[PDB]
From a paper:
Here, we isolate and describe the conserved rixosome from Chaetomium thermophilum, which consists of two sub‐modules, the sphere‐like Rix1‐Ipi3‐Ipi1 and the butterfly‐like Las1‐Grc3 complex, connected by a flexible linker. The Rix1 complex of the rixosome utilizes Sda1 as landing platform on nucleoplasmic pre‐60S particles to wedge between the 5S rRNA tip and L1‐stalk, thereby facilitating the 180° rotation of the immature 5S RNP towards its mature conformation.
Since the Rix1‐Ipi3‐Ipi1 complex is known to exhibit a large hollow sphere with a diameter of ~9 nm in yeast (Barrio‐Garcia et al, 2016; Kater et al, 2020) and the reconstituted ct Las1‐Grc3 heterodimer a butterfly‐like structure of 13 nm × 7 nm (Pillon et al, 2017), we conclude that we can observe the entire rixosome by electron microscopy. Once again, we observed the spherical density, which we attribute to the Rix1‐complex, and the butterfly‐shaped Las1‐Grc3, both arranged in such a way that the shorter edge of Las1‐Grc3 is preferentially oriented toward the Rix1 complex, with a distance of about 35 Å. While the cryo‐EM reconstruction of the complete rixosome could only be resolved at low resolution and did not reveal any apparent connecting density, both sub‐complexes could be resolved individually to resolutions of 2.9 Å (Rix1 complex) and 3.0 Å (Las1‐Grc3 complex). Characteristically, the Las1‐Grc3 assembly displayed a two‐fold symmetry as observed previously, with two copies of Las1 and Grc3 and without densities for nucleotides or RNA, thus representing the apo‐state (Pillon et al, 2019). E The Las1‐Grc3 was found in the apo‐state. Strikingly, AF2 multimer predicted with high consistency an interaction between the Las1‐CC and an intertwined bundle of two CC α‐helices formed by the two C‐termini of Ipi3.
Residue numbers in the entry:
A (entry chain A), C (entry chain D): 1 to 28, 38 to 178, 344 to 363
B (entry chain B), D (entry chain E): 107 to 340, 348 to 455, 468 to 488, 495 to 568, 608 to 692, 718 to 727
Write the structure that this text describes.
């Protein structure tokens, strides 16, 4: 038979373009190139926000968008006047969502599993789990640790999810006329 | 082990067929019937009871829909009772929805007739378990006391609260049917209208999902919520007084606006209850902890119900204590705890309700369905460029989340949106309506993110965006709706506003054409990937 | 006897000045006034970051600094290009820390308490607990909800903690000379 | 119920006093002694065993500190054994720390003498329970096998890993004492030096908290970690070869640098082990899950230990499996599981160790303490304005967290900071040392937040910032340190760097003056509020 999976993106080309915008170095300096990379990353994170609004977005895409948004907020302007709780809080919420979603997806209710056991089963480093626990029950982790862990987490998500997607290279209301109407899929004009 | 659902035994005398598929059944004693499918009940002699509804020979034909996804209503006949069972004409259209969704094929009987009497468990369809409709004796005693108090005191308000999956909906249906149909004393007494305040967006009755509604019933509710998902506005059996779009399955996006909606709906009930005595039955969300408990307390404080009925005996003590405090704070409001008699997930039933709503024809039986796929229907074209008098809709308002203007077209495409009539100009105050207009969509910025005011707006219905055409020559929206063309052409363009919210994505509509083509046999579709 | 509580601030005047910088409207328009208020709030959040580095800072001060930092990052520049995951993530981490610290402080291990029961015992609205749960196990809450809840949470922390503090109105290394030395407390020159 | 700690019974013959408070005790049979306080052991005839250390009449006087916060060492005498117990001279200074902290008052015996023999439980101080030092028989058997293998194979490496509160420290002390003092065959054999690699920052031995160290011992470790918190650099009984500042109680701030520190320390051990055979005992953090397990695996891979000893039989199976995998990956490394024989919290013991370190005199007994409060001592003035040759310190480097430059003075004030000698210029590469300098502090920006490289830097000691004077006439830091003035004056200003980290706040030093004044009797102090 034929089974259908419903995706927030219209087609796989949209998903691969968003992957290229998250990861310009894998898919493919000057200040214009850096500004272009930042603008494309902002566009991609906005698209993933729309996808999460639509529903059915995978957890890895949301985690990548959250980490890239935290990195972009770090790079655009550091809250040195405010001590960095804006940037560190963005990093901490990204890590909380990422680790919580991964562990909740891969946990089993039948067998009592520690969070480190689930992290070992997935292959996630335990540094992210400890970072989530420190951000939740203790003070926020420092900005340098959050930066390094965010870069390592983005690489881990690339190797986990993004690489396997594909090869890397009353005139207001008028009833429409029945003679010229040709049936189309939903969403096509 | 075989379980006997129907105690009736047929022979040549009692059981008789008649042309057109109709059936004449004479029971000299009390008998029970479990009938699966769509049928019509009209009694020639005697009194029958179905789903708490009492039918007499004076009463007209009552149309029953009984899919086996829900509990099958049990039809009980007293001694010396002659009834007639009629096939349902409209039901065929609903059964043709089996061509578009495999879920709609599992609902009904496999017999060629519309209805099949289930004598034993062997008469059930294969791999399906049939559950009869049941009521606790405590429920019947409480409804009898409520009927006595209703006869004593005109127009009572009955608040029905409880946890999710506690059987509050079944108790609400039997309560409504017994308030409507049961007559004491004179048999010449007519049926009373009953008004239902449906405040549950997640699992609504008489309204599509994400909608709170106020409904007036002169005919018993013998059908599942997806069998009457949308009722035409106002002599019909079931008419809708007012509707509001929560635009979510839960009030957690905005509780206060939710309460405001209830206030407005309650006001309209008062504008009926002054002229005639009408009982009101209030259906509440299955949210009993956190913000939902405060919502229930606020609803008790707003509606001032005659009685409050908590549907679970084994409910949490903090919830029962909060509800008792909310009752005792206002006045002496009787708070009664009731037993909770508790396959198909609520999300699947919600999707079936939305699909059945969108397949309603614009034109016994109340509702009629269109078997044509949504991809094959000619869509409404809503002009987006021009003066606010010239445009089909005034603008697009997003609820609780503000997209970037470039992302609105991708966000609303192929999604369910609400169609809202702006009755008063005070609703648009504080919001920048776009002026005389790839051209952009007419987008009204909503920095607060709160919904439109219930007391100045109403919900005409739900639409589904077939497509968005942002060409410079003709910017327009193609959309599909079950609202009749006369209603749509009655409103002016500046009165109508499209509303984006958190309705579920209509994923049934995307593969509806593929399912129809596959069934008829025996390119890339947006938002669908296919396994092979 | 005499009992000592050690505080990250040198004296109570420093704490009351930080309270005045968090809450200018309670302790006491033009663009200069708005810029001054923003600068003082940034200074106060930086001071609370230093206090958390020192140790012994109360949880309410950290929660106030996190919420004020999230509000400042919202007001300075909204991530409309990035869809607001920077701002919404800052709000979500502030709420996660605030609700987690309050519940962990007021929970009892002896009696099995639901999180809503602890929230009712404290007096915290259950909206904050539900917002924490949605930010953790579901997608991030919307920006408008996070703004409204942040303002309500700041008012709640003011009524809970901040109001009760007070009324509101070899020449490189030389040993120091023993004749000139007068003993002083640690930290005073 | 009375519990008999000491089996000795005194009379006129065996037990005699001698002037100066000394005692002569002759036991014709095997006897046990539990002595509380500070004393000295020198045997005239026969062999005694205390805390795994074997003492013979050839050996000199051994000084024992036994507070009842830790387990009291038990002194066992064989048959026909004449011993002498000596009072400790320096101990009075430590007891005068009771004037500054109530915690240091509860540690020792209430008798006027320095040491008191505890015959029964009634001889204990009031409201205090005395626990004897104990070792499992499995521990003694394993140490005997280790001694045989050590005699067979020169300079073994013994890795001691385990959970927190598993008694790994007691096993480490007895292992070190038995490797040092036990001689087989000839009684004329001298004691062997034992080198200890202390990699536990949270609960260190021979080093202040937040410091990893490499120590050489020619004298048995018969004292608690706070009784020898800081050892002078190198013929002494205990000398420190090298230290590095983790600047935290846990390696979780930077694991890799932690491993780097171990590598450097291990290298120095090799630079000894080539010339002479010296056993090395490695003390590891009590972190057995998460990043700590990877740290233990990395330490096993780096050090290549002769044996690995897990101190818990009932440890988690994932931890034991990971350690077994780490052992088997390198070579055939024997992994042995041992029993875990398990008041005063570790944080309080850490604060006592830091206070005892800062109260060490600059000038068996090894250490001597200064009873003077830290508020009364004349502080070192470190000049902050001038050329890098002229300034006392080159700059201030913050570990793992970068303060704003206005907040550095408030952050470092009244806090423990590390003093780091820059041996090689490669450590400063990549960092902007401030040039010729209210004037700002000399602050070296550290954008990565990583600590300085262990292989190019060393730790002179820990300092405590008495105060910060940012006046334009004389910008300086007043600070207190137990480092001798000759060591401080040996270094040039451009070699020294002050390091801010995550040491605990020295809250004892703030109220030390208040406690001293209150005890002597029988303004606002920064960072202290007083209840009345």
């Amino acid at each position: 038979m034929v089974q259908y999976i419903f995706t927030p993106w219209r087609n796989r080309a949209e998903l691969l373009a968003v992957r290229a915008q998250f990861y310009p170095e894998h898919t493919s300096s000057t200040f214009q190139d850096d500004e272009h990379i930042r603008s494309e990353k902002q566009k991609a994170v906005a698209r993933v926000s729309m996808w999460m609004q639509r529903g059915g977005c995978p957890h890895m895409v949301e985690s990548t968008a959250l980490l890239v948004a935290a990195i972009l907020s770090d790079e655009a302007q550091g809250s040195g006047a405010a001590g960095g709780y804006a940037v560190r809080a963005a990093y901490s919420a990204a890590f909380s969502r990422f680790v919580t979603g991964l562990l909740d997806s891969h946990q089993d209710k039948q067998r009592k599993q520690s969070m480190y056991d689930v992290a070992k089963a997935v292959g996630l480093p335990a540094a992210f789990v400890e970072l989530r626990h420190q951000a939740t029950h203790e003070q926020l982790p420092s900005l340098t640790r959050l930066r390094s862990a965010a870069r390592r987490a983005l690489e881990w998500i690339w190797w986990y999810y993004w690489k396997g997607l594909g090869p890397v290279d009353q005139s207001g209301w008028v009833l429409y006329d029945e003679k010229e109407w040709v049936p189309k899929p939903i969403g096509i004009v | 082990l075989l379980r006997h659902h129907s105690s009736f035994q047929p022979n040549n005398s009692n059981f008789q067929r008649k042309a057109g598929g109709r059936l004449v059944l004479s029971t000299p004693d009390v008998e029970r019937f479990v009938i699966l499918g769509n049928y019509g009940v009209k009694v020639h002699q005697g009194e029958v009871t179905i789903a708490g509804a009492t039918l007499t020979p004076i009463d007209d034909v009552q149309w029953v829909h009984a899919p086996h996804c829900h509990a099958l209503p049990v039809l009980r006949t007293a001694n010396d009772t002659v009834i007639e069972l009629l096939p349902c004409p409209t039901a065929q259209g609903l059964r043709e929805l089996a061509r578009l969704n495999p879920l709609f094929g599992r609902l009904w009987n496999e017999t060629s007739d519309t209805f099949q009497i289930i004598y034993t468990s062997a008469d059930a369809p294969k791999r399906t378990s049939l559950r009869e409709l049941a009521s606790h004796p405590a429920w019947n005693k409480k409804i009898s006391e409520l009927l006595t108090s209703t006869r004593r005191k005109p127009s009572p308000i009955l608040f029905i609260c409880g946890p999710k999956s506690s059987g509050k909906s079944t108790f609400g249906r039997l309560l409504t049917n017994r308030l409507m149909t049961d007559r004491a004393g004179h048999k010449s007494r007519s049926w009373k209208p009953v008004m239902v305040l449906d405040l549950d967006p997640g699992q609504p009755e008489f309204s599509p999902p994400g909608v709170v509604s106020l409904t007036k019933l002169r005919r018993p509710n013998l059908a599942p919520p997806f069998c009457h998902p949308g009722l035409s506005f106002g002599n019909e059996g079931m008419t809708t007084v007012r509707m509001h779009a929560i635009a979510s399955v839960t009030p957690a996006l905005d509780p206060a606006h939710f309460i405001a909606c209830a206030r407005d709906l309650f006001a309209y009930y008062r504008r009926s209850a002054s002229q005639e005595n009408i009982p009101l039955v209030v259906n509440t969300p299955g949210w009993i902890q956190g913000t939902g408990l405060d919502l229930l307390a606020e609803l008790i404080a707003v509606l001032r119900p005659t009685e409050v009925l908590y549907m679970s005996e084994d409910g949490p003590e903090e919830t029962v204590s909060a509800l008792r405090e909310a009752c005792a704070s206002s006045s002496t409001i009787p708070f009664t705890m009731l037993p909770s008699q508790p396959s198909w997930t609520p999300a699947t039933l919600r999707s079936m309700a939305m699909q059945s709503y969108f397949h309603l024809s614009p034109f016994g039986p109340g509702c009629e369905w269109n078997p044509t796929p949504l991809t094959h229907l000619c869509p409404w074209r809503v002009r987006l460029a021009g003066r606010p008098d010239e445009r089909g809709v005034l603008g697009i308002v997003c609820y609780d989340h503000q997209y970037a203007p470039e992302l609105v077209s991708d966000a609303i495409n192929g999604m369910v949106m609400g169609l809202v009539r702006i009755e008063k100009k005070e609703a648009l105050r504080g919001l920048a309506v776009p002026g005389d207009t790839t051209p952009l969509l007419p987008l009204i910025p909503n920095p607060t993110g709160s919904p439109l005011s219930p007391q100045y707006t109403s919900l005409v219905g739900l639409v589904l965006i077939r497509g968005v055409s942002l060409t410079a020559s003709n910017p327009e929206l193609h959309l599909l709706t079950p609202v009749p063309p006369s209603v749509l052409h009655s409103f002016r363009g500046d009165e109508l506003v499209l509303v984006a919210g958190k309705f579920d994505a209509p994923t049934w509509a995307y593969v509806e054409g593929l399912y129809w083509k596959s069934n008829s046999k025996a390119d890339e579709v947006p938002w669908v990937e296919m396994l092979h």
